[PDB]
Amino acid sequence: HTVCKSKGSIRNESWHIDSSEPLCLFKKNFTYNVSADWLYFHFYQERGVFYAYYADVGMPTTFLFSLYLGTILSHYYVMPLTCNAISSNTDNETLEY
Amino acid sequence: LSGFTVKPVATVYRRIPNLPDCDIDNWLNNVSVPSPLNWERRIFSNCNF
Amino acid sequence: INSGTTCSNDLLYSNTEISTGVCVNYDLYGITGQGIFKEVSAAYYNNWQ
Ligand SMILES: *[C@@H]1O[C@H](CO)[C@@H](O)[C@H](O)[C@H]1NC(C)=O
């Protein structure tokens, strides 16, 4: 699960537990417009390499990276957003993925 | 006839590093020097140096 | 040793200067070939290109 920064719940974000930093193949931060409206993302694997594309504004989609893993991923999921300002009594706002 | 097709020896290699730097010099040049009794340790992983 | 991800950078990619004018082998950005380099001033490139 994952919690929200602003108007957080009475819980804490805890989805993984590690006593040491594991070995990773890619780690880099990205920035986008805070005043955007709709975001688009593309993901696909082929010939053993995986791709990622992101877009914050406009019709096309920009490039992120091209990773080599040698395996074939099969599953994908979207963690829920536990918060308190996504209710009817709060401001009118819902979550769509 | 075929002329002289000798191939050069130089080679140019440019590629995205894909990983951030370790910044070991930034940690070794800190303004605060730890005492020999504390000897604060540092761990570096998933980075290039 | 010889494992993990924290590899070195001065092994073979010493970031040589662009020796424009002569024919040289290109092995950069995952593309092999040969050619001559020239110097221009372009502005159509983007951050992800
Ligand atoms: C990415 O942002 C997080 C949160 O601010 C930070 O802890 C991390 O060091 C950043 N990573 C890079 C590569 O800037």
Coordinates of C-alpha atoms and ligand atoms in Angstrom, one line a residue:
Chain A
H1 CA 0.0 0.0 0.0
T2 CA 0.9 3.7 -0.2
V3 CA -0.2 6.7 1.8
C4 CA -0.5 10.3 0.8
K5 CA 1.8 13.2 1.8
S6 CA -0.8 15.9 2.2
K7 CA -3.8 15.1 4.5
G8 CA -2.2 11.7 5.4
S9 CA -4.1 9.0 7.1
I10 CA -3.5 7.5 10.6
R11 CA -1.4 4.8 8.9
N12 CA 2.1 4.7 7.5
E13 CA 3.4 3.7 4.0
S14 CA 4.9 0.2 4.3
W15 CA 5.1 -2.1 1.3
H16 CA 8.7 -3.4 1.5
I17 CA 11.1 -4.0 4.3
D18 CA 14.9 -4.2 3.7
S19 CA 17.7 -3.9 6.3
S20 CA 20.2 -3.0 3.5
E21 CA 20.2 -1.3 0.1
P22 CA 19.8 -4.1 -2.5
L23 CA 21.4 -4.1 -5.9
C24 CA 19.6 -2.1 -8.5
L25 CA 20.0 -1.6 -12.3
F26 CA 18.4 1.9 -12.7
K27 CA 17.8 4.8 -10.4
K28 CA 17.0 8.3 -11.6
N29 CA 14.5 11.0 -10.7
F30 CA 12.2 12.8 -13.2
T31 CA 10.4 16.2 -13.0
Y32 CA 7.1 17.3 -14.5
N33 CA 4.7 20.2 -14.4
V34 CA 2.8 20.4 -11.2
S35 CA -0.1 22.2 -13.0
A36 CA -0.7 19.4 -15.5
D37 CA -4.1 17.9 -16.4
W38 CA -3.6 14.4 -17.8
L39 CA -0.5 12.1 -17.9
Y40 CA 0.2 9.3 -20.3
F41 CA 2.6 6.4 -20.0
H42 CA 3.7 3.5 -22.2
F43 CA 5.4 0.3 -21.2
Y44 CA 6.3 -2.7 -23.4
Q45 CA 9.0 -5.4 -23.6
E46 CA 10.5 -7.0 -26.8
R47 CA 13.5 -9.2 -27.6
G48 CA 14.4 -9.1 -23.9
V49 CA 14.5 -5.4 -23.5
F50 CA 11.9 -3.2 -21.7
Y51 CA 10.9 0.4 -22.6
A52 CA 9.2 3.2 -20.7
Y53 CA 7.6 6.4 -22.1
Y54 CA 6.1 9.3 -20.1
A55 CA 4.2 12.4 -21.1
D56 CA 2.7 15.2 -18.9
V57 CA 1.3 17.6 -21.6
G58 CA 0.5 17.1 -25.3
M59 CA -0.6 14.3 -27.6
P60 CA 2.8 12.5 -28.1
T61 CA 4.9 10.7 -25.4
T62 CA 8.5 11.3 -24.5
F63 CA 11.2 8.7 -23.9
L64 CA 12.5 7.6 -20.5
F65 CA 15.0 4.7 -20.7
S66 CA 15.6 1.3 -22.3
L67 CA 16.5 -1.4 -19.8
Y68 CA 18.0 -4.9 -20.4
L69 CA 16.8 -7.7 -18.1
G70 CA 16.9 -11.0 -20.1
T71 CA 13.6 -12.1 -18.5
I72 CA 10.0 -11.7 -19.4
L73 CA 7.7 -9.8 -16.9
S74 CA 4.2 -11.0 -16.7
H75 CA 2.3 -9.1 -14.0
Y76 CA 1.6 -5.4 -13.2
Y77 CA -0.4 -3.7 -10.5
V78 CA -1.4 -0.3 -9.2
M79 CA -1.0 0.2 -5.4
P80 CA -4.0 1.9 -3.7
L81 CA -3.8 5.4 -2.5
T82 CA -4.9 5.5 1.2
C83 CA -5.8 9.1 2.1
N84 CA -8.5 11.2 3.7
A85 CA -9.3 13.9 1.2
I86 CA -10.8 11.5 -1.4
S87 CA -14.2 11.2 0.3
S88 CA -17.6 12.7 -0.3
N89 CA -17.5 14.9 2.8
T90 CA -14.1 16.3 1.6
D91 CA -13.5 18.1 -1.7
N92 CA -15.0 16.5 -4.8
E93 CA -12.1 14.5 -6.2
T94 CA -11.8 10.8 -7.2
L95 CA -9.1 8.5 -8.3
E96 CA -8.9 7.1 -11.9
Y97 CA -6.3 4.8 -13.3
Chain B
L1 CA 40.8 -2.6 -59.5
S2 CA 40.3 -2.2 -55.8
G3 CA 42.2 0.6 -54.1
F4 CA 43.6 1.1 -50.6
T5 CA 40.8 0.3 -48.1
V6 CA 42.9 0.6 -45.0
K7 CA 40.7 0.9 -41.9
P8 CA 41.7 3.5 -39.2
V9 CA 42.6 2.7 -35.6
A10 CA 40.9 5.3 -33.5
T11 CA 37.5 4.6 -31.9
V12 CA 34.9 6.9 -30.3
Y13 CA 32.6 5.6 -27.6
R14 CA 29.8 7.8 -26.1
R15 CA 26.9 6.3 -24.1
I16 CA 24.5 7.4 -21.4
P17 CA 25.9 6.4 -18.0
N18 CA 22.4 5.2 -16.9
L19 CA 23.5 5.5 -13.3
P20 CA 24.4 8.4 -11.0
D21 CA 27.8 9.1 -9.6
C22 CA 28.9 8.0 -6.2
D23 CA 30.1 11.5 -5.2
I24 CA 32.9 10.1 -3.0
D25 CA 34.9 13.3 -3.3
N26 CA 32.0 15.3 -1.9
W27 CA 31.9 13.1 1.2
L28 CA 35.6 13.0 1.7
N29 CA 35.8 16.8 1.5
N30 CA 33.2 17.5 4.2
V31 CA 33.5 20.5 6.4
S32 CA 33.0 18.3 9.5
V33 CA 35.8 15.8 10.3
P34 CA 34.5 12.9 12.5
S35 CA 36.6 12.0 15.5
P36 CA 38.6 8.8 15.6
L37 CA 36.2 7.6 18.3
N38 CA 33.1 8.0 16.2
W39 CA 34.4 7.1 12.7
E40 CA 31.0 7.4 11.0
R41 CA 30.8 4.9 8.2
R42 CA 29.3 5.4 4.7
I43 CA 27.9 2.9 2.3
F44 CA 27.8 3.4 -1.5
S45 CA 25.9 1.2 -3.9
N46 CA 24.3 1.4 -7.4
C47 CA 26.6 4.2 -8.5
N48 CA 29.6 4.9 -10.7
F49 CA 33.0 6.3 -9.5
Chain C
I1 CA 34.7 -8.7 -7.4
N2 CA 33.7 -8.6 -11.1
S3 CA 30.0 -8.5 -10.0
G4 CA 27.4 -6.1 -8.8
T5 CA 26.6 -2.8 -10.6
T6 CA 29.2 -0.3 -9.3
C7 CA 31.5 -0.5 -12.2
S8 CA 34.4 1.8 -13.1
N9 CA 34.5 4.4 -15.9
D10 CA 38.1 4.8 -16.9
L11 CA 38.5 1.2 -18.1
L12 CA 38.0 1.9 -21.8
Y13 CA 35.6 4.9 -22.1
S14 CA 38.1 7.6 -21.5
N15 CA 35.8 10.2 -23.2
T16 CA 38.1 11.0 -26.1
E17 CA 37.8 14.3 -27.9
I18 CA 35.9 14.4 -31.2
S19 CA 38.6 14.1 -33.8
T20 CA 36.6 15.8 -36.6
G21 CA 38.1 15.8 -40.1
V22 CA 39.3 12.1 -40.4
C23 CA 37.4 8.9 -40.8
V24 CA 36.8 7.1 -37.5
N25 CA 34.7 4.2 -36.2
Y26 CA 31.5 4.9 -34.4
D27 CA 30.5 2.6 -31.5
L28 CA 28.4 5.2 -29.6
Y29 CA 24.7 5.1 -28.4
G30 CA 24.5 1.4 -29.4
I31 CA 25.2 1.9 -33.1
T32 CA 28.2 0.5 -35.0
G33 CA 29.7 1.9 -38.1
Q34 CA 32.3 4.3 -39.6
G35 CA 32.2 7.9 -40.7
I36 CA 33.6 11.4 -40.6
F37 CA 32.5 13.9 -38.0
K38 CA 31.7 17.6 -38.6
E39 CA 30.8 20.5 -36.3
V40 CA 27.4 22.3 -36.5
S41 CA 25.1 24.3 -34.3
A42 CA 21.7 22.6 -34.1
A43 CA 18.6 23.5 -32.0
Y44 CA 16.0 20.8 -32.8
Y45 CA 17.3 18.3 -30.3
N46 CA 15.3 17.8 -27.1
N47 CA 16.1 16.5 -23.6
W48 CA 15.0 12.9 -24.4
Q49 CA 16.7 12.9 -27.9
Ligands
LIG1 C1 14.9 11.4 -5.8 O1 14.0 12.0 -4.9 C2 14.0 11.4 -3.6 C3 13.0 12.2 -2.7 O2 13.3 13.6 -2.7 C4 15.4 11.5 -3.0 O3 15.5 10.8 -1.7 C5 16.4 10.8 -3.9 O4 17.8 11.0 -3.4 C6 16.3 11.4 -5.3 N1 17.2 10.8 -6.2 C7 18.0 11.4 -7.1 C8 18.8 10.5 -8.0 O5 18.0 12.6 -7.2

